Design an enzyme around this catalytic site. Sequence first.
Site, PDB file in Angstrom:
ATOM      1  N   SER A   1      -3.054  27.927  -5.951  1.00 16.11           N
ATOM      2  CA  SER A   1      -2.819  29.324  -6.298  1.00 16.11           C
ATOM      3  C   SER A   1      -3.340  29.670  -7.686  1.00 16.11           C
TER       4      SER A   1
ATOM      5  N   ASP B   1       5.808  22.453 -28.213  1.00 19.10           N
ATOM      6  CA  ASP B   1       6.083  21.099 -27.757  1.00 19.10           C
ATOM      7  C   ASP B   1       7.256  21.138 -26.788  1.00 19.10           C
TER       8      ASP B   1
ATOM      9  N   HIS C   1      15.313  14.909  11.542  1.00 18.19           N
ATOM     10  CA  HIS C   1      14.132  14.850  12.394  1.00 18.19           C
ATOM     11  C   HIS C   1      13.506  13.463  12.408  1.00 18.19           C
ATOM     12  N   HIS C   2      13.833  12.620  11.429  1.00 22.57           N
ATOM     13  CA  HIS C   2      13.390  11.236  11.402  1.00 22.57           C
ATOM     14  C   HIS C   2      14.307  10.317  12.197  1.00 22.57           C
TER      15      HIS C   2
ATOM     16  N   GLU D   1      11.070  14.809  -0.337  1.00 21.33           N
ATOM     17  CA  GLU D   1      10.175  14.165  -1.297  1.00 21.33           C
ATOM     18  C   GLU D   1       8.735  14.620  -1.107  1.00 21.33           C
TER      19      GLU D   1
ATOM     20  N   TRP E   1       7.508   0.521   3.826  1.00 25.76           N
ATOM     21  CA  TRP E   1       7.855   1.565   2.867  1.00 25.76           C
ATOM     22  C   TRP E   1       9.325   1.953   2.993  1.00 25.76           C
TER      23      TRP E   1
ATOM     24  N   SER F   1      13.545   6.838 -13.888  1.00 21.84           N
ATOM     25  CA  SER F   1      12.584   7.310 -14.881  1.00 21.84           C
ATOM     26  C   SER F   1      12.056   8.693 -14.526  1.00 21.84           C
ATOM     27  N   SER F   2      11.739   8.919 -13.248  1.00 21.54           N
ATOM     28  CA  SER F   2      11.266  10.233 -12.827  1.00 21.54           C
ATOM     29  C   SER F   2      12.341  11.292 -13.029  1.00 21.54           C
TER      30      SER F   2
ATOM     31  N   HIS G   1      12.746  13.383   3.383  1.00 22.76           N
ATOM     32  CA  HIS G   1      12.216  14.651   3.877  1.00 22.76           C
ATOM     33  C   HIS G   1      11.806  15.598   2.752  1.00 22.76           C
TER      34      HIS G   1
ATOM     35  N   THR H   1       5.218  28.960   5.071  1.00 21.82           N
ATOM     36  CA  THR H   1       3.940  28.314   4.795  1.00 21.82           C
ATOM     37  C   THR H   1       2.789  29.080   5.437  1.00 21.82           C
TER      38      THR H   1
ATOM     39  N   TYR I   1       7.675  17.435   0.179  1.00 21.76           N
ATOM     40  CA  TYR I   1       7.558  18.815  -0.293  1.00 21.76           C
ATOM     41  C   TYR I   1       7.497  18.884  -1.815  1.00 21.76           C
TER      42      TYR I   1
ATOM     43  N   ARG J   1       2.647   2.146  16.019  1.00 28.39           N
ATOM     44  CA  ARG J   1       2.127   1.870  14.689  1.00 28.39           C
ATOM     45  C   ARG J   1       2.695   0.558  14.160  1.00 28.39           C
TER      46      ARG J   1
ATOM     47  N   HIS K   1       0.830  -1.200   0.000  1.00 32.34           N
ATOM     48  CA  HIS K   1       0.000   0.000   0.000  1.00 32.34           C
ATOM     49  C   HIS K   1       0.866   1.251   0.000  1.00 32.34           C
TER      50      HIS K   1
ATOM     51  N   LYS L   1       2.123  31.989   3.271  1.00 28.43           N
ATOM     52  CA  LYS L   1       1.353  31.579   2.096  1.00 28.43           C
ATOM     53  C   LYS L   1      -0.127  31.422   2.430  1.00 28.43           C
TER      54      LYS L   1
HETATM   55  C1  HEA Z   1       3.101  15.368   2.815  1.00 29.09           C
HETATM   56  C2  HEA Z   1       3.868  16.428   3.035  1.00 29.09           C
HETATM   57  C3  HEA Z   1       4.400  16.824   4.351  1.00 29.09           C
HETATM   58  C4  HEA Z   1       4.445  18.072   4.839  1.00 29.09           C
HETATM   59  C5  HEA Z   1       3.983  19.349   4.199  1.00 29.09           C
HETATM   60  C6  HEA Z   1       5.038  17.966   6.143  1.00 29.09           C
HETATM   61  C7  HEA Z   1       5.244  19.019   6.939  1.00 29.09           C
HETATM   62  C8  HEA Z   1       6.028  18.994   8.048  1.00 29.09           C
HETATM   63  N1  HEA Z   1       6.495  17.849   8.675  1.00 29.09           N
HETATM   64 FE1  HEA Z   1       6.223  15.969   8.176  1.00 29.09          FE
HETATM   65  N2  HEA Z   1       6.120  14.178   7.502  1.00 29.09           N
HETATM   66  C9  HEA Z   1       5.662  13.735   6.289  1.00 29.09           C
HETATM   67  C10 HEA Z   1       5.141  14.585   5.323  1.00 29.09           C
HETATM   68  C11 HEA Z   1       4.984  15.956   5.387  1.00 29.09           C
HETATM   69  N3  HEA Z   1       5.369  16.663   6.471  1.00 29.09           N
HETATM   70  C12 HEA Z   1       5.783  12.254   6.168  1.00 29.09           C
HETATM   71  C13 HEA Z   1       5.388  11.303   5.009  1.00 29.09           C
HETATM   72  C14 HEA Z   1       6.341  11.859   7.349  1.00 29.09           C
HETATM   73  C15 HEA Z   1       6.707  10.446   7.823  1.00 29.09           C
HETATM   74  C16 HEA Z   1       7.934   9.900   7.205  1.00 29.09           C
HETATM   75  C17 HEA Z   1       7.939   8.420   7.211  1.00 29.09           C
HETATM   76  O1  HEA Z   1       8.050   7.865   8.324  1.00 29.09           O
HETATM   77  O2  HEA Z   1       8.003   7.838   6.104  1.00 29.09           O
HETATM   78  C18 HEA Z   1       6.547  13.033   8.140  1.00 29.09           C
HETATM   79  C19 HEA Z   1       7.100  12.983   9.396  1.00 29.09           C
HETATM   80  C20 HEA Z   1       7.580  14.045  10.088  1.00 29.09           C
HETATM   81  C21 HEA Z   1       8.407  13.956  11.277  1.00 29.09           C
HETATM   82  C22 HEA Z   1       8.866  12.615  11.900  1.00 29.09           C
HETATM   83  C23 HEA Z   1       8.301  12.255  13.282  1.00 29.09           C
HETATM   84  C24 HEA Z   1       8.642  10.830  13.708  1.00 29.09           C
HETATM   85  O3  HEA Z   1       8.302   9.875  12.986  1.00 29.09           O
HETATM   86  O4  HEA Z   1       9.379  10.682  14.697  1.00 29.09           O
HETATM   87  C25 HEA Z   1       8.663  15.257  11.658  1.00 29.09           C
HETATM   88  C26 HEA Z   1       9.413  15.626  12.741  1.00 29.09           C
HETATM   89  O5  HEA Z   1       9.962  16.697  12.767  1.00 29.09           O
HETATM   90  C27 HEA Z   1       7.972  16.118  10.683  1.00 29.09           C
HETATM   91  C28 HEA Z   1       7.922  17.524  10.648  1.00 29.09           C
HETATM   92  C29 HEA Z   1       7.239  18.328   9.721  1.00 29.09           C
HETATM   93  C30 HEA Z   1       7.230  19.779   9.775  1.00 29.09           C
HETATM   94  C31 HEA Z   1       7.912  20.640  10.775  1.00 29.09           C
HETATM   95  C32 HEA Z   1       6.472  20.223   8.731  1.00 29.09           C
HETATM   96  C33 HEA Z   1       6.189  21.667   8.388  1.00 29.09           C
HETATM   97  O6  HEA Z   1       6.277  21.845   6.967  1.00 29.09           O
HETATM   98  C34 HEA Z   1       4.787  22.139   8.737  1.00 29.09           C
HETATM   99  C35 HEA Z   1       4.646  23.647   8.667  1.00 29.09           C
HETATM  100  C36 HEA Z   1       3.199  24.042   8.537  1.00 29.09           C
HETATM  101  C37 HEA Z   1       2.537  24.692   9.505  1.00 29.09           C
HETATM  102  C38 HEA Z   1       3.102  24.676  10.892  1.00 29.09           C
HETATM  103  C39 HEA Z   1       1.184  25.280   9.342  1.00 29.09           C
HETATM  104  C40 HEA Z   1       1.158  26.698   8.744  1.00 29.09           C
HETATM  105  C41 HEA Z   1       1.908  27.713   9.568  1.00 29.09           C
HETATM  106  C42 HEA Z   1       1.332  28.722  10.252  1.00 29.09           C
HETATM  107  C43 HEA Z   1      -0.155  28.951  10.515  1.00 29.09           C
HETATM  108  C44 HEA Z   1       2.248  29.659  10.937  1.00 29.09           C
HETATM  109  C45 HEA Z   1       1.977  29.816  12.409  1.00 29.09           C
HETATM  110  C46 HEA Z   1       2.233  28.550  13.214  1.00 29.09           C
HETATM  111  C47 HEA Z   1       2.713  28.509  14.485  1.00 29.09           C
HETATM  112  C48 HEA Z   1       3.498  29.628  15.103  1.00 29.09           C
HETATM  113  C49 HEA Z   1       2.228  27.475  15.446  1.00 29.09           C
HETATM  114  N4  HEA Z   1       7.309  15.359   9.725  1.00 29.09           N
HETATM  115  C1  HEA Z   2       0.615   8.901  -1.004  1.00 26.10           C
HETATM  116  C2  HEA Z   2       0.342   8.986   0.295  1.00 26.10           C
HETATM  117  C3  HEA Z   2      -0.653   8.150   0.992  1.00 26.10           C
HETATM  118  C4  HEA Z   2      -1.979   8.094   0.781  1.00 26.10           C
HETATM  119  C5  HEA Z   2      -2.793   8.871  -0.214  1.00 26.10           C
HETATM  120  C6  HEA Z   2      -2.491   7.121   1.722  1.00 26.10           C
HETATM  121  C7  HEA Z   2      -3.783   6.762   1.824  1.00 26.10           C
HETATM  122  C8  HEA Z   2      -4.304   6.093   2.888  1.00 26.10           C
HETATM  123  N1  HEA Z   2      -3.572   5.419   3.849  1.00 26.10           N
HETATM  124 FE1  HEA Z   2      -1.628   5.199   3.982  1.00 26.10          FE
HETATM  125  N2  HEA Z   2       0.276   5.198   4.183  1.00 26.10           N
HETATM  126  C9  HEA Z   2       1.210   5.975   3.551  1.00 26.10           C
HETATM  127  C10 HEA Z   2       0.876   6.931   2.603  1.00 26.10           C
HETATM  128  C11 HEA Z   2      -0.369   7.202   2.073  1.00 26.10           C
HETATM  129  N3  HEA Z   2      -1.485   6.584   2.509  1.00 26.10           N
HETATM  130  C12 HEA Z   2       2.589   5.649   4.009  1.00 26.10           C
HETATM  131  C13 HEA Z   2       3.954   6.247   3.588  1.00 26.10           C
HETATM  132  C14 HEA Z   2       2.416   4.666   4.940  1.00 26.10           C
HETATM  133  C15 HEA Z   2       3.474   3.924   5.767  1.00 26.10           C
HETATM  134  C16 HEA Z   2       3.917   2.664   5.130  1.00 26.10           C
HETATM  135  C17 HEA Z   2       4.783   1.857   6.019  1.00 26.10           C
HETATM  136  O1  HEA Z   2       4.508   1.892   7.236  1.00 26.10           O
HETATM  137  O2  HEA Z   2       5.530   1.009   5.479  1.00 26.10           O
HETATM  138  C18 HEA Z   2       1.012   4.407   5.038  1.00 26.10           C
HETATM  139  C19 HEA Z   2       0.487   3.465   5.892  1.00 26.10           C
HETATM  140  C20 HEA Z   2      -0.813   3.384   6.274  1.00 26.10           C
HETATM  141  C21 HEA Z   2      -1.315   2.626   7.409  1.00 26.10           C
HETATM  142  C22 HEA Z   2      -0.375   1.814   8.341  1.00 26.10           C
HETATM  143  C23 HEA Z   2      -0.893   0.526   9.002  1.00 26.10           C
HETATM  144  C24 HEA Z   2      -0.538   0.437  10.484  1.00 26.10           C
HETATM  145  O3  HEA Z   2       0.371   1.156  10.937  1.00 26.10           O
HETATM  146  O4  HEA Z   2      -1.328  -0.168  11.228  1.00 26.10           O
HETATM  147  C25 HEA Z   2      -2.685   2.829   7.418  1.00 26.10           C
HETATM  148  C26 HEA Z   2      -3.586   2.313   8.306  1.00 26.10           C
HETATM  149  O5  HEA Z   2      -4.457   3.016   8.747  1.00 26.10           O
HETATM  150  C27 HEA Z   2      -2.983   3.709   6.278  1.00 26.10           C
HETATM  151  C28 HEA Z   2      -4.239   4.186   5.864  1.00 26.10           C
HETATM  152  C29 HEA Z   2      -4.521   4.941   4.713  1.00 26.10           C
HETATM  153  C30 HEA Z   2      -5.866   5.294   4.300  1.00 26.10           C
HETATM  154  C31 HEA Z   2      -7.114   4.919   5.021  1.00 26.10           C
HETATM  155  C32 HEA Z   2      -5.753   6.035   3.150  1.00 26.10           C
HETATM  156  C33 HEA Z   2      -6.846   6.632   2.289  1.00 26.10           C
HETATM  157  O6  HEA Z   2      -7.892   5.659   2.123  1.00 26.10           O
HETATM  158  C34 HEA Z   2      -7.554   7.878   2.792  1.00 26.10           C
HETATM  159  C35 HEA Z   2      -8.632   8.338   1.825  1.00 26.10           C
HETATM  160  C36 HEA Z   2      -8.146   8.279   0.395  1.00 26.10           C
HETATM  161  C37 HEA Z   2      -8.777   7.595  -0.575  1.00 26.10           C
HETATM  162  C38 HEA Z   2      -9.844   6.621  -0.182  1.00 26.10           C
HETATM  163  C39 HEA Z   2      -8.382   7.595  -2.009  1.00 26.10           C
HETATM  164  C40 HEA Z   2      -9.098   8.631  -2.899  1.00 26.10           C
HETATM  165  C41 HEA Z   2      -8.800   8.512  -4.373  1.00 26.10           C
HETATM  166  C42 HEA Z   2      -9.568   9.030  -5.355  1.00 26.10           C
HETATM  167  C43 HEA Z   2     -10.955   9.656  -5.216  1.00 26.10           C
HETATM  168  C44 HEA Z   2      -9.190   8.670  -6.739  1.00 26.10           C
HETATM  169  C45 HEA Z   2      -8.614   9.799  -7.553  1.00 26.10           C
HETATM  170  C46 HEA Z   2      -7.969   9.335  -8.853  1.00 26.10           C
HETATM  171  C47 HEA Z   2      -7.507  10.131  -9.854  1.00 26.10           C
HETATM  172  C48 HEA Z   2      -8.403  11.127 -10.511  1.00 26.10           C
HETATM  173  C49 HEA Z   2      -6.269   9.807 -10.638  1.00 26.10           C
HETATM  174  N4  HEA Z   2      -1.826   4.044   5.586  1.00 26.10           N
END
Ligand code: HEA
Ligand code: HEA
Lengths: 121, 238, 88, 69, 268, 537, 57, 100, 69, 45
Positions: free
Chosen positions: F261, F97, F295-296, F248, F132, F162-163, F246, F321, F250, F444, F67, F324
């Site tokens: 926008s 093109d 941070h991870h 990816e 993952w 490819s990407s 990290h 952010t 963004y 988890r 998944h 924005k």
């Molecule tokens: C999908 C995109 C996305 C985005 C945008 C972000 C945004 C951020 N993420 Fe996250 N993050 C993930 C995707 C993302 N992350 C994923 C996939 C993981 C898990 C990785 C994995 O295990 O595979 C992860 C995990 C993850 C961790 C790991 C925790 C753990 O597993 O131990 C941490 C820790 O620092 C973190 C931090 C942040 C921070 C600081 C931001 C910041 O960008 C957020 C900033 C945004 C705001 C805060 C809101 C707007 C701001 C304002 C309104 C200003 C005023 C606010 C204050 C003064 C309060 N992220």
């Molecule tokens: C791309 C990012 C992404 C997205 C979209 C999702 C989608 C979802 N994920 Fe997943 N998930 C991850 C990224 C993502 N996940 C990652 C990185 C992990 C960790 C893997 C690891 O641990 O190894 C994870 C793991 C993970 C777990 C971990 C299991 C465990 O720890 O017990 C669970 C369980 O709740 C979960 C739930 C869901 C659910 C309910 C949705 C969704 O169902 C929520 C609602 C969304 C939809 C139902 C789909 C809607 C789609 C459309 C309407 C079609 C549009 C099509 C086009 C027009 C092209 N995800």
Amino acid sequence: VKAAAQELANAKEPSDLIGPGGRDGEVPTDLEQATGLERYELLSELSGRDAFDMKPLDASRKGTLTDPIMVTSLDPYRHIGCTGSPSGSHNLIWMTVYKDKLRRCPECGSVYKLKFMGDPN
Amino acid sequence: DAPSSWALYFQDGASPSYLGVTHLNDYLMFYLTFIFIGVIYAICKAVIEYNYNSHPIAAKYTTHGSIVEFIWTLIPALILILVALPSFKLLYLLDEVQKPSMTVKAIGRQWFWTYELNDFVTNENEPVSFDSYMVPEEDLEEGSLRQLEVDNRLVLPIDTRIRLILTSGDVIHSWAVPSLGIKCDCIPGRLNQVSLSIDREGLFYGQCSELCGVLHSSMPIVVQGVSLEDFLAWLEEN
Amino acid sequence: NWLEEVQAEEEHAKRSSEFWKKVTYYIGGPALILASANAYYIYCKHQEHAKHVEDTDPGYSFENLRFKKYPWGDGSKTLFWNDKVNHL
Amino acid sequence: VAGLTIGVVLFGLIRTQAAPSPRTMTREWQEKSNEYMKENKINPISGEASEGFKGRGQISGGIFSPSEK
Amino acid sequence: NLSTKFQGHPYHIVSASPWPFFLSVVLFFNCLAATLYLHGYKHSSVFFGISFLGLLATMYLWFRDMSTEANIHGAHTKAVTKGLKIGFMLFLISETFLFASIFWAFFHSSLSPTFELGAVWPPVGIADKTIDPLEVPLLNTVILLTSGASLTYAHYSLIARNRENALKGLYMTIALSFLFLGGQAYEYWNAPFTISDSVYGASFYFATGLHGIHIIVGTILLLAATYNIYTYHLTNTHHNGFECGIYYWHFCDVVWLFLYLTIYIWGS
Amino acid sequence: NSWWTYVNRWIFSTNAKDIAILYLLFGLVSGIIGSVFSFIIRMELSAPGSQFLSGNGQLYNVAISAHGILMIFFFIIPALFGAFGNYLVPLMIGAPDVAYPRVNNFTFWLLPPALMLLLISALTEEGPGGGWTVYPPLSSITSHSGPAIDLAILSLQLTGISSTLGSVNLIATMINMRAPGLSLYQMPLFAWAIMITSILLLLTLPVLAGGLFMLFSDRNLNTSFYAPEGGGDPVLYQHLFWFFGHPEVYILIMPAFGVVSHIIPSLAHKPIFGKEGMLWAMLSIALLGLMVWSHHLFTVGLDVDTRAYFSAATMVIAIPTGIKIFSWLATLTGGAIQWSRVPMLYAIGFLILFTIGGLTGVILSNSVLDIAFHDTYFVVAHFHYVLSMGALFGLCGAYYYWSPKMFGLMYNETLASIQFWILFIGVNIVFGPQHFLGLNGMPRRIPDYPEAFVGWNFVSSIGSVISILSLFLFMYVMYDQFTSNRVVKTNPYLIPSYFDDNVIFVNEKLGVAQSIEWLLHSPVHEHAFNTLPTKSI
Amino acid sequence: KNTIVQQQRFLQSIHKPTYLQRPGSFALVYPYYAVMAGLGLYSLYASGRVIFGKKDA
Amino acid sequence: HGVSLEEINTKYNDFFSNVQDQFELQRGLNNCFAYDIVPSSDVIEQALRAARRVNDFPTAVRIFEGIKVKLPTKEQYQAYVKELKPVCNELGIVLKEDLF
Amino acid sequence: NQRALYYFNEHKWPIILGTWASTMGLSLYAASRNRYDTAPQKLIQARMYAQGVTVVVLLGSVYLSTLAN
Amino acid sequence: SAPKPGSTIPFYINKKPLPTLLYFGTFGVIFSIPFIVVKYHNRNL
Ligand code: HEA
Ligand code: HEA
Ligand SMILES: CCCCCCCCCCCCCCCC(=O)OC[C@H](COP(=O)(O)OCCN)OC(=O)CCCCCCCCCCCCCCC
Ligand SMILES: CCCCCCCCCCCCCCCC(=O)OC[C@H](COP(=O)(O)OCCN)OC(=O)CCCCCCCCCCCCCCC
Ligand SMILES: CCCCCCCCCCCCCCCC(=O)OC[C@H](COP(=O)(O)OCCN)OC(=O)CCCCCCCCCCCCCCC
Ligand SMILES: CCCCCCCCCCCCCCCC(=O)OC[C@H](COP(=O)(O)OCCN)OC(=O)CCCCCCCCCCCCCCC
Ligand code: CUA
Ligand SMILES: [Ca+2]
Ligand SMILES: [Mg+2]
Ligand SMILES: [Zn+2]
């Protein structure tokens, strides 16, 4: 140059654009070993004119009905954009100008009359 | 200490770092609830009243920030500093080391946990070691908690601080306990040094977090505090 | 027009080409031959072999790891396996 | 509204075809554990061993903890 | 009206081209064959060879068709060749950032060795078996430097509209690259340690392999370029490939000098 | 004989328009499989204990890993990053093109074999089990014996390359094929964002290529790269992986920023507030999102000074952010709003979910705070409530906003709005209880859990079911739109102002748009931009 | 000797695609396509053998 | 920044003093109703004269409709209609609420 | 001086990086002043100068490294 | 060649009575693949 300009003027079909060719034993030059659209581009650039139109329009001479700003148009539809008064007047909006009709600016009121340097068919 | 049903807060625990962590979490939540409700209300109100049927004219000629962008830069950054400082002094308090007393070892290979107390090696030449195992569901004591008990339960005295040693000899594990708020990675080859201090005399629960194969969810960890006389009796028992 | 600029460019290119020919046939050659002579001396100095050592703390416990069988041959041979510098 | 109710109904219908629940999901065992962890002062601050504690604690209630069949 | 029969943009038009899809298919074939050969499955010998010949045929035909289109149709306008140069530069920057991965890998494996390594990055007992700074590889480095000098000489002479000088410089460069490859093979055969022997050998072998394959790509580029030159298909300004190869070779030489600085000085 | 014409128009065709549609279709067929996988895994944890299965933990690991991998690398990246860029970027830059048509054709077709080989790998006796983020010792031949995870490694490798190959032509196209009079500063925000993602992806992914190859070589060549006894340190693997992971997310979410926008102004009839400040803050985000990677690795056990250095800088990401979001809030007010439009609905719903997800992300950016939430359900809630609320919503909004330009059809507004509401409610009640489940201190990736957690899982399961009906409704509406023959004008999103006569507007006002793509007919010509549009220099 | 102009003019007279403009190119692709089809047919059985745990003997 | 509050009022009154084209009249009239600046009596009166000159009726009633929409309260609109009634009766202008 | 040489050969890496930067900057300043010399060509010439200086300082350093009394 | 698109790029012909079953069957099988996937791992058990 002048001889090359005469060669450019004297042409019938694109099949006739060729290069004379170089001499064996020495590296040739593009002036004799060019073919295809690259040859056309080089002759057009040396002749003093432009192969295609790449002239950005000017923001002065605010549009008037009697004297609209002229826009080069190899096509009946020649999409353009308007900034209006000299750069910074207003946001850039896009316009399309049809055959010999006038498109007026909705913020500055500038009309861009159109011509056609080619037979429709 | 133990999970409840329909819980909303974290839990009731006992550890010097755990109270500080909860305090910091309370302050940080107080910070963010403000901004969350503010942005929600702004989004709701800027649209619920400015629909097309009520506002057919748009003031399209305001796209410059005179004094607003500066305040946008400053005020949330001020909040950022205000939240960063307490966490920074908490961390700079935690990174120090107190006066060492004794150590425990938490080496665990796969689906079971082994503990060692080799501080008390003496003429007896009988270092104490054992293995905590997942209790089967069928053999659970009447009224026991499923998935959260072990047979050879770990024993640490209360009010005594221990410099726990974390080590592994297999795929990486983790050593977690939410009540004590202490965690580190059971990374093979390298030993992780962590501390601990129990205030009460009670049973604490926890388990690993980093997946280690099929049975990652089969090594619960239970540590309970004991008084000095009970601790001594336990030590002389083996 | 084009004649003067092309003549100047070709003249500069020809001068640089002559300078680079002098570079490649004046200093590069002596350096290459000196390095070759020194390399030959180093190669001929150590023609004593004796590349068969054992029992002096053998193995060291991180040599020739075999977790998946090597595809070539039986599974205990490498592509550049040698009977004098590779041992066990 | 129709989509929400269809989802709820379909989940309920496909719910019953699961494996039998563990034997520990009975009211008797839940209350036995509730009176058990009170003895060992497991969370006595505001949880399983509070002074008054009218609340449940370690019982989910409803269908999650049915009576013994 | 000559412009009437012509288009209005100087950018090329391509169609058909079954090369990408079948190239993807043959790459999938190669990946499956390699995966099977890793575990030593039977009948995994001819599969890899057939897949590799298919890959060779497909991208050779792709390159031939692309060069033909760049030759007869004359779509090599100034904008197109400029964009090609920027794309090649972007690719070599990507290659630099790819090599940075192995660079940081060696740095991490070296700066903080494990506690079973004897508190020294050079392994105990293998430290005396390392590569001395002054040996055949130093000769190879000086050969590569002289090869780059000769290639620059040939390029400048070609700018001076000279066939003999540039051709002789290219011949010397090709011969020097071939002898460098032979010397590298000799050093590979006389490697004191295998890749599986500790992390030092693994990192050394990984670092050397990428440079080797890049140099192979450079040699095939040089032989192809001399093929076009002999075939009389290169002119003064229709020479994008020459400059691309020159820049790539200077880039690879810089990477090689950095490798020579680190692996054979710091590690010995 | 149209069969030759059929396959020349589809397979042996290199036009940008004929490829993005296949990008969308491939994304859809990956996303359905991923959604069903997510549904099955969420139905497993409906109640404690083995359920619908024979306690097969390895099967659950395979399900979660599949998944995650397929929905992060086959659903969102290929169907958003390059799908809406290759079709649309030439339109806004002023080019007919892309720079290299052949590489554009090649990049797409590397993905189908990747999907087939990933399915084959998952169909082995064991299957991938590292999740993952696969880890070396678990992936070591000691645990898995067979061609299960090697093919997953290969799929990740080839998809990444490819990407990278699908992003080299885009940068050249939008750096050299610019319109006459179109300064790079004056570029639209969407293409700005897409170029930033392209450069970031190309800069970072090679590192993954090298690291993944060297880690994979441990299984075959028996290298000591990461062996604990061989001198390898897996913390090096974690550092290498999280120097990529990290940024990816963004680079995945920036196209959502651009599409929001773009959606806001046209449906708001108001220019975007502070374009230059927004783009410069986004550039600051792009540069900033590289020096923070550890941070991870907060609870791995690194030094105090390194932890402080890489935890203090985690907070500064929030400021641009927030700027924005404030700019978008300011843009929304004042100008007219058509809240009934589906793209407007998705754009409005994106903001609140993204900001609450950002607040959750700033919750756990401290080493003092992460210890209570590291590798628990709270991080799951954070990253899901950011990913599936931002990228998925942006993709849905982009589809519903540019679909007439892709094909030339009209969808059903009622069904689309119903689908949006159902999906919003379902995804809000799916990731809601998980916040409490992770706040209690429960980890988890566990098919079984202690008994005192059943209620929130039960609350999540119903929403998981609801999401499937949302998917069904989206499928129905897509089919209906495809076979409804509902015509569309040149610029369907242009309306007369408050003082435009019904006869003056129809004859002396048509053919005007804020962007180029709305100037051409909704089914765009094969050869557009015969002459270059020239603006005011 | 410089036949590039003569062959250029000879080959520009045809309307075939550039991958079939040069005569004799067709004979190098049809057996190539047949070999690719055979490779696919063999790889189908290879993958089917890989997924189903067994080895021929 | 650029023009201030009253300067654009005077500028648009001067512009509407002489307009002979319907398109230009509508353009300027659109651009005037975006500065949060309700036109003064001279501006609206001159706009009505311009609409009379360029021979377009519905623009005149659209003026009052837009002013009623833009104005904050009923009292200001009532004052405007009280002070502008004679003009409307002179030029035969019928309000929306009385039109149907 | 019998002490300056000790620090000159003690830290070979920092001084070698400093002299590499100095050569790079000086070559860029000197070369980027002519007309018939494009930026890539001048950069290549500067890098060739850097390679030659690096080779000669490498030979000098390995020559002086024998003094380890 | 100057053709005018008919605003129809569906990759395959669509109409009411017949193609609906094909589309729905393709959707169903691509939805139900995970099923056979989960069944395969528990075949010999
Ligand atoms: C999908 C995109 C996305 C985005 C945008 C972000 C945004 C951020 N993420 Fe996250 N993050 C993930 C995707 C993302 N992350 C994923 C996939 C993981 C898990 C990785 C994995 O295990 O595979 C992860 C995990 C993850 C961790 C790991 C925790 C753990 O597993 O131990 C941490 C820790 O620092 C973190 C931090 C942040 C921070 C600081 C931001 C910041 O960008 C957020 C900033 C945004 C705001 C805060 C809101 C707007 C701001 C304002 C309104 C200003 C005023 C606010 C204050 C003064 C309060 N992220
Ligand atoms: C791309 C990012 C992404 C997205 C979209 C999702 C989608 C979802 N994920 Fe997943 N998930 C991850 C990224 C993502 N996940 C990652 C990185 C992990 C960790 C893997 C690891 O641990 O190894 C994870 C793991 C993970 C777990 C971990 C299991 C465990 O720890 O017990 C669970 C369980 O709740 C979960 C739930 C869901 C659910 C309910 C949705 C969704 O169902 C929520 C609602 C969304 C939809 C139902 C789909 C809607 C789609 C459309 C309407 C079609 C549009 C099509 C086009 C027009 C092209 N995800
Ligand atoms: C398709 C691309 C494949 C090549 C990629 C090159 C990338 C360069 C960086 C990687 C380092 C390579 C070093 C190994 C070279 C070597 O020969 O390894 C050394 C060993 C033997 O040496 P030795 O012990 O005798 O040395 C000590 C001397 N006394 O030989 C091998 O194991 C042969 C296999 C190595 C792989 C090279 C050929 C690849 C064919 C299979 C393709 C696999 C595809 C994988 C999935 C896409
Ligand atoms: C394991 C890792 C593998 C990584 C492989 C990396 C490969 C990518 C390297 C990028 C180089 C692209 C060439 C320059 C781009 C360019 O400039 O193309 C534009 C130029 C146009 O120039 P022109 O108008 O002067 O001549 C017009 C001629 N008709 O085309 C060329 O003529 C190239 C000139 C030499 C190329 C001849 C063939 C050489 C093949 C080398 C590779 C062989 C296969 C190697 C194994 C796959
Ligand atoms: C990710 C890191 C891996 C290394 C990076 C290289 C990736 C493979 C090489 C692809 C070429 C890069 C761009 C070159 C510049 C360029 O653009 O060449 C120009 C053309 C496209 O442009 P055009 O002809 O339309 O231009 C218009 C001219 N006026 O390219 C190509 O036809 C590429 C040739 C097809 C090759 C694709 C198959 C890739 C095999 C990958 C496996 C081998 C590596 C394995 C690694 C373990
Ligand atoms: C964490 C939360 C803390 C909040 C602290 C911030 C406090 C300061 C913010 C207020 C500054 C802007 C007010 C305008 C003052 C003014 O009068 O500006 C002058 C202009 C007047 O128009 P003009 O330029 O054409 O005048 C021309 C002069 N000849 O106004 C505007 O254009 C407003 C247009 C954009 C502003 C929209 C605001 C949208 C929400 C903003 C943030 C909401 C916060 C939500 C959370 C609380
Ligand atoms: Cu033990 Cu995970
Ligand atoms: Ca379950
Ligand atoms: Mg962890
Ligand atoms: Zn204007």
